[PDB]
Amino acid sequence: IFSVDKVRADFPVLSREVNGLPLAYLDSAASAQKPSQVIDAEAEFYRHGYAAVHRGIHTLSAQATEKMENVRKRASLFINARSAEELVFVRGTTEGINLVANSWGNSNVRAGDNIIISQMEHHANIVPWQMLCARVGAELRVIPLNPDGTLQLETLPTLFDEKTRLLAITHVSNVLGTENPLAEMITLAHQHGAKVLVDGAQAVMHHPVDVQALDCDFYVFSGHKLYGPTGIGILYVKEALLQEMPPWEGGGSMIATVSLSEGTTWTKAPWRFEAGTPNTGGIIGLGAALEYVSALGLNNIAEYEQNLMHYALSQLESVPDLTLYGPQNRLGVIAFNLGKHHAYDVGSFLDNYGIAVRTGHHCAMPLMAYYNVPAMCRASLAMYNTHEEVDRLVTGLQRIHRLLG
Template sequence: MHREDFPMLKQDIVYFDNGATSLKPQVMIDAMVDYYSNHTANIHRGDYDAAIKTDALYDEAREVVKNFLHAESSREIVFTSGMTDGMNRIVFGFMKYQLKPGDEVLISKAEHASCAIPWYVLQEELGIVVRSVPLDSEHQLTIQNLESMISPKTKVISLSHITNVIGDVRDVEKIGEIAEKNHIYFVVDAAQSVSHVPVDVLKMKASFLVFSGHKMLGPTGVGVLYGKMDLLSKMRPLCYGGGMNEFFESTGEYKIREVPTCFEAGTPPIAEVIGLSRVIQYIESIGVENIHKHEVELKKYLVSELLKIPNIVLYNKSSESGILAFNIRGVFSQDTAVYLNHYHIYIRAGNHCSKMLKDDLNIKNTCRVSMHLYNTKEDVDKLVLALKNSEDIFKIIL
């Protein structure tokens, strides 16, 4: 779908590494170039035409994100540098001051490093206990397993909406219900889900939700932290400086501004925020449901074709997203990635920043195909053909 909108696709490539970062549509590039070429200005400081235009676009972006996430107020939207930044702000700006030693945080072994390591650091610093919910035989999280881990000590459930290797779509609405019923904070990593499936922070009763712009067809260097207003008002900034203070005096007195401005110290990534806003409008014009349907159909086709090749091992056939992890039997994943690059097919090899998942998969490294709206049946056919002919892999890569 919409391949003509993506300048990278003018090259003869098959791009299957969307879990790492996605390609960018021309409309997003144009919006950023327009800022740099025609109305460069800082925000909230200038009284000239370019600054007024930039202010309006920056403020509009918060509204665009709010509507996209179905949040109650644009004040619940904080611009960050990405999902990792957002998670660290939640853990060290909020949870550090709300949790007590012995409080439990539930995660899973399929979580990305950014959704595990901050919790482990807080475990060291504060004496909270981080526990992993066991995954089922398909390496997926089940509601039963999650519920079995909940105790009166459980204070946080912190999970990805869609995991980045297995690609299972967690039932976040059900998890949100369980969290609310048990007075547990629910933190959602939407890095792999936003732009792939509908994200509604109210339906999922999320306390906090984070994602990056660059995995959702948007720019690098920008992300979003959503938090419920009453929680954000208790969150402490991790960064202090210009733009976020009401006043400061030589006596040492200062006052920080209200949410969300207090969380955006210094000059924010203005061009990136404008680009993100434009790309969300682009995604909405296509429809997230249509993107999801397209990716799931393509994955089913890919799985059906790969099952015909005897030496291909699949790790997550059943998950309902555009993510498939596989290996050629007896071939190290990086060698497969180098081989596929020979045919201009871009996939990812490795542990995909989910280093705990090896305990469940019994393998450390896999090849990962991750799709987006512009992938086609022809892309899948090219990949399948290359894998069918992979008996000569070492003649090609060495």
């Protein structure tokens, strides 16, 4: 069982004040605050063991290399990949999706083929596929939404066919909180020979993620949402697919040999996908974030967060003219609009109360268009958030509505 007070004492920003008021940080879905264990693991690495990492002969450099490869192995166990070598270090979910779209996409999606996405995808899981489709002459097909924020799965028989090469689908919506039925959609996709990329940016901090039970072909996530540093993320690819993928970025460390008269040859997976100096400091920080989350326990985190979400939805019923978007069983985020007030104004008043929510289109324009709204407000309810912060949000929305209505 979980202790929110003990957890909160590890996060230094949660003591801050904003506008003279105590911060209520409800925007973890945009980026999470980091525990002092993560902040300090990175700072200690810079203060005591820093060096370049490409298997340098000297001591600091050989030990930094081993730290980096141990982080690769730990992340691989965290998502239950069969091996550390199925994981590539990237800048974040966005970069991982771009790597797949170019490296796998340019050789496997041809003129006349199709790719399937959904109407709830974040721009990171839309734009790279629009670019791939435009480069190769393929078609981009879209699984539509239902009013409750779930996918219309009955449309799948019209979207999947013999030309469907990939399904790119979000694990958990960053706006709606919907968890998609990935295992079943992947079974479906594989019956047609299509591969499946899963955008897990909003899944890995809420519950255990097992890529071998999912059977996904590609899985991506970002460290800064998982209580870790910015600039680091993970791309998981089944070994047999990764081994056949050609390099995306070129440069040092991804090569086996470089010649100006005989050409260049590439090293093996995963190192063929990592050109130049990696983000070593971010990788040390990400390992520490995975150890911190694992020590708390993702099933404990999930129980606390679900309890907090039930509490907030129950209290939000006393806000007049509140519109919520998404299913009742939503994870992590609450997307809402208040009466006829523009989200930008509701968010500005909430910020004047010390409450940080996100407002706007949340990098999901197609989703805003589905709901016929230009924008929404969104409250994130993470493992360090409390009942008292939920009460402050409810009181604030009641005050706002009283004032502007």
